[PDB]
Amino acid sequence: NMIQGALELRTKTVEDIMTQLQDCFMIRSDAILDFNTMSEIMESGYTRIPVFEDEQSNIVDILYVKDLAFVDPDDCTPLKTITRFYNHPVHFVFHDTKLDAMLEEFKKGKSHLAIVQKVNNEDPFYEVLGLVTLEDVIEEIIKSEI
Amino acid sequence: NMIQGALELRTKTVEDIMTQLQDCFMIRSDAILDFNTMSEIMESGYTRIPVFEDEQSNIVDILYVKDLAFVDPDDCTPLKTITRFYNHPVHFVFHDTKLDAMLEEFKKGKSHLAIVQKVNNEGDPFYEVLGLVTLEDVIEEIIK
């Protein structure tokens, strides 16, 4: 039993865990932080929000919502200021990657949020299927062993 | 790797993971939101701050720092107004609770900060507040 849960964990990929891109809450890099955008970001509940340029599949920066604390919606400062400030390293991963290697990347200090990419032959280009995070990994651990 | 994470997940008690109370960053519930207060909350780096009344051991509320988005410090807004307005839940947990079980409690939708309680027989017995443990604390203790 412990064996089956263990290797069933070890056999999953990020594709099988990751929240799908269409169910993720993202934000356009051009966006300005006004009461509507701000309120939306809060109401979303996500602590880390992807910031993408143009097409949804190209993710430039990452927004930590605690950083919106002092932003006043009356100043209407664009999120572009914030993301162009940070330039957090974006974390990319192959869709076939096993969870143990993922846990290695997280142990080495990489961003706890990671973006799932697959080579699309349909020249081949890299498409973004969605997002997986360390919390999803550990969730799979404690779920699958029981 | 996965095995190491699961095993360390089921051995460690939240007491081992926890941040002691004396070293916590808390805020009194009567505090007001002027520049020193907001600047302190910002430089603390905590995303969820415990809110207490009288002694530090009595933790009445929780402040999600992101709420503070809609406050301005020139208003001198009482933290009591915010705490009464959102009414966020406080989470208590037994000092013997294993880490994975704690992940189950947080996963149920409870606040991602949890207060660790011990039973104290040493002088009528009472429940004792040792500190707090956060979901982030748990995950960090898995990757180390």
Residue numbers in the entry:
A (entry chain C): 360 to 481, 485 to 508
B (entry chain B): 360 to 482, 485 to 505
How did the manuscript describe this experimental structure?
The Cyclin and CBS domain divalent metal cation transport mediators (CNNMs) are the most recently identified proteins involved in magnesium cation (Mg2+) transport across the cell membranes. The four known members (CNNM1 to CNNM4) encoded in the human genome are integral membrane proteins with strong homology to CorC, a bacterial magnesium/cobalt efflux protein. Structurally, the CNNMs are complex multidomain proteins that consist of four independent domains connected by linkers of different length. The intracellular region is directly attached by a long α-helix (H0) and comprises two distinct domains, a Bateman module and a cyclic nucleotide monophosphate binding-like domain (cNMP domain).
The CNNM4BAT domain is formed by two consecutive CBS motifs, CBS1 (residues 371–435) and CBS2 (436–505), that present a αβαββα fold and contact each other via their three-stranded β sheets, resulting in an overall pseudo-C2 symmetric structure. As in other CBS domain containing proteins, CNNM4BAT features two major symmetry-related clefts, S1 and S2, formed between their stacked β-sheets (central right panel). Of note, an acidic cluster (E497, D498, and E501) at the N-terminus of α-helix H4 in S2 replaces the positively charged residues found in S1 (R407, K425, H471, T406). As observed in other CBS-domain containing proteins, including CNNM2 and CNNM3, CNNM4BAT self-associates into a disk shaped head-to-head dimer commonly referred to as “CBS module” (upper and central right panels) where both CBS1 and CBS2 pack against their equivalent in the complementary subunit. In CNNM4, this disk is semi-twisted and both CBS1 motifs are slightly separated. In the semi-twisted conformation, the CNNM4BAT dimer interface is stabilized by an extensive network of hydrophobic interactions. Upon dimerization, the H0 helices from complementary CNNM4BAT subunits lie crossed, as observed in the twisted conformation of CNNM2BAT, and participate in the CBS2 dimer interface via their residues N360, M361, I362, A365, and L368.
